[PDB]
Amino acid sequence: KSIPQPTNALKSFNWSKLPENKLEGTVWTEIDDTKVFKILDLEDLERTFSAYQKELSVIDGRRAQNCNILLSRLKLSNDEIKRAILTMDEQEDLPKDMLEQLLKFVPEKSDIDLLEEHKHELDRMAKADRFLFEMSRINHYQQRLQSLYFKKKFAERVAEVKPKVEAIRSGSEEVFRSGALKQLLEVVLAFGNYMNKGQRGNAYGFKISSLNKIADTKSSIDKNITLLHYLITIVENKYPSVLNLNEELRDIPQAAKVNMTELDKEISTLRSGLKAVETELEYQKSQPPQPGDKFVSVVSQFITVASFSFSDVEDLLAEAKDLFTKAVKHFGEEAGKIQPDEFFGIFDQFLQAVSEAKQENENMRKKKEEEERRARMEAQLKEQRERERKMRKAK
Amino acid sequence: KSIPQPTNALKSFNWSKLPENKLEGTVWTEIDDTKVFKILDLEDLERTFSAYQKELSVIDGRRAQNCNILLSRLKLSNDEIKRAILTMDEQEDLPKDMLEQLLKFVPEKSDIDLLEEHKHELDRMAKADRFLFEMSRINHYQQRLQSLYFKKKFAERVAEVKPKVEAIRSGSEEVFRSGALKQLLEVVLAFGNYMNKGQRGNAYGFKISSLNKIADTKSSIDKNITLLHYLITIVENKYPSVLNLNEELRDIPQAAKVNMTELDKEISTLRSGLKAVETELEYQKSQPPQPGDKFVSVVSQFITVASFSFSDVEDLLAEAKDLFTKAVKHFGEEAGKIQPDEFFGIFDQFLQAVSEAKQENENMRKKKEEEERRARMEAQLKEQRERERKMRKAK
């Protein structure tokens, strides 16, 4: 083994050791620190990196300064911090954003091993060192801290995810049962089968993305009248039911915005975080009640509502994905190969286009009433002077 | 089957038809366009979307306008365009960025089927329609166009990828054989095994990321002297060979910047694009020579250099990845689980840190010569007035 050890304790080097079972291939086979000790002025090393300064400081300066920032922000003593953890923060001294930061500065195995070396010198310890040591004394510090954070973030995390599950469920259902859309597809099929002479045009169906190409066909009379303007106009007196499309697909714009990777990522943290709280509740239940420890009392209340609430979220999600699968197939898309953002994005762009066309049409119609009054007035005003000329002729 | 067809040709609807083998589950089972034809004023449809306007215009307005933009930019007639394709652009009328755009407006099966309907009316065709039709007449238009583009982009694509393959090869080799680094790791191991009392500190090796934690340990004498400043100073008179580290790992900063996903993506397009040119050369070779067709003549010359050049790139890449695998294992990392950007990023940050420390040390040393002249001058200037006082005492 062989290395010598100091006269007094030293500051630590925050390294990560390689397991010995990972050597044999490596540089370290060729390396041997035991000769360095003879070469180095160890006395100088000890003086310049002593543990003392007189305060005990062993945790590295970077990590220590990061703590001192958090502690100056949290404004709690270690006694206060332990009470806040133990009572699951009944005085509300640990906001979400502080718990988050506190979850980054959780003492590690090697940190505690080190401060253990100085357990008889807590009163000499620098602020960060004493904080990390005191925190390592609280039973199941990390998993109480994780549980408190999860608890405080559960309501907003369910509120984030639920509207997205509703959008997929609703849009999927809407697209599947909309009679305005099904009648429009049949009229548009007719249009293409007539316009696309011969072959190119014995279709029994088309891809839903084709909807977003209708406005691309332009009138040979006026080039700002597209085939979509024309559809929307024809349909008024021929298939009026089609005009209920914006109403029947009202939740498509919102379903269009649901990212499925991010949805699943949210359900994933909710699920695994809830299992982690349940696990810590089983550990904590199997431990003798201590005064000022309110974990079992509080976490049980939370799981009751949280487990019911998430179970329901999981149900709405399972069923929403089912309907989406049915809706995808209903329009000839490959299940698995298309996401809601894309599928409902086809429909949402179309609704934006149908909406734009509706308006532009409406602005045309109002020129053709503005200028029909020109033909109505000039018809009556022409004949009025004509009656006063036949009077002037006779007279 | 059953639909009626127009008295005169119509403008097209740019749809994408669903194969009939994809129905049976879908809305289209419930849809039937044959009733719409009886309901619609077809005569009005025909008037308002006639093919004529008198120019023939059948391709949709969006795609047509996109063409007209490209053609007004390219400034070539269709005769000129065919000559440029056929001669592999010997007059250099097709820049890379135009070929790119030209590769987007390549006529599709359904476009040609349609313009085929009007092959006896080319002289009536709108600009875009005639362009797309003429282009569909050139033997293997798309794959001649793809080949010309590939050819023009090959030199810059090899120049993009090669420096990256060299960086991985060089950095991997450097890291593996650097004696300055291996001596530094042994000194730092010594440091941690001495400073990390007891357990925490019978290490035989550490993770290379630990290098970037050395400067985190701060001196208890001056807090701006870190353990890295201290290492760099100690090493001058004890292990001077270590100071050659910046020189021995000179290519680490560049290897640090190589994204492997993007490297492979570049090699992937080079490889598959070259196979596609080789394929089109085999087709074209197996066809009787036509005047003004210089494809076989030009592509053969290109493959000779391109196939030799890419073969070599593939060799440098195969070997670079081998060395990287050896270099990764040499420092106890899991092969497969770490990329060059990360592995060499550990080393590059370290070199940035060692460089910063070197300087900061050097600025300290120059205070300690600036203020050693204070102790040298004030030692001699104190004794000079002392000699003129013992003279004044005697006198």
From Swiss-Prot, chains A, B:
Residues 358-395 are annotated as: Disordered. Keywords: Actin-binding, Cell projection, Coiled coil, Cytoplasm, Cytoskeleton, Phosphoprotein, Wnt signaling pathway. Residues 358-395 have a biased composition (Basic and acidic residues). GO terms for biological process: presynaptic actin cytoskeleton organization; Wnt signaling pathway, planar cell polarity pathway. GO terms for molecular function: actin binding; identical protein binding; small GTPase binding. Expressed in all tissues examined. Residues 64-73 are annotated as: Actin-binding. One of its GO terms (cellular component) is perinuclear region of cytoplasm. Disulfide bonds: none annotated. Residues 1-380 form the FH2 domain. It is found in: Cytoplasm; Cytoplasm, Cytoskeleton, Cilium basal body. Homodimer. Interacts with CIP4, FNBP1 and FNBP1L. Interacts with the SH3 domains of Abl, BTK, endophilin, spectrin and SRC. Binds specifically to GTP-bound CDC42 and RHOA. Interacts with INTU; INTU mediates the indirect interaction between DAAM1 and NPHP4. Interacts (via coiled coil domain) with KANK1 (via coiled coil domain). Belongs to the formin homology family. Binds to disheveled (Dvl) and Rho, and mediates Wnt-induced Dvl-Rho complex formation. May play a role as a scaffolding protein to recruit Rho-GDP and Rho-GEF, thereby enhancing Rho-GTP formation. Can direct nucleation and elongation of new actin filaments. Involved in building functional cilia. Involved in the organization of the subapical actin network in multiciliated epithelial cells. Together with DAAM2, required for myocardial maturation and sarcomere assembly. During cell division, may regulate RHOA activation that signals spindle orientation and chromosomal segregation. The C-terminal DAD domain may participate in intramolecular interactions with the N-terminus. This is Disheveled-associated activator of morphogenesis 1. The lineage of its organism: Eukaryota, Metazoa, Chordata, Craniata, Vertebrata.
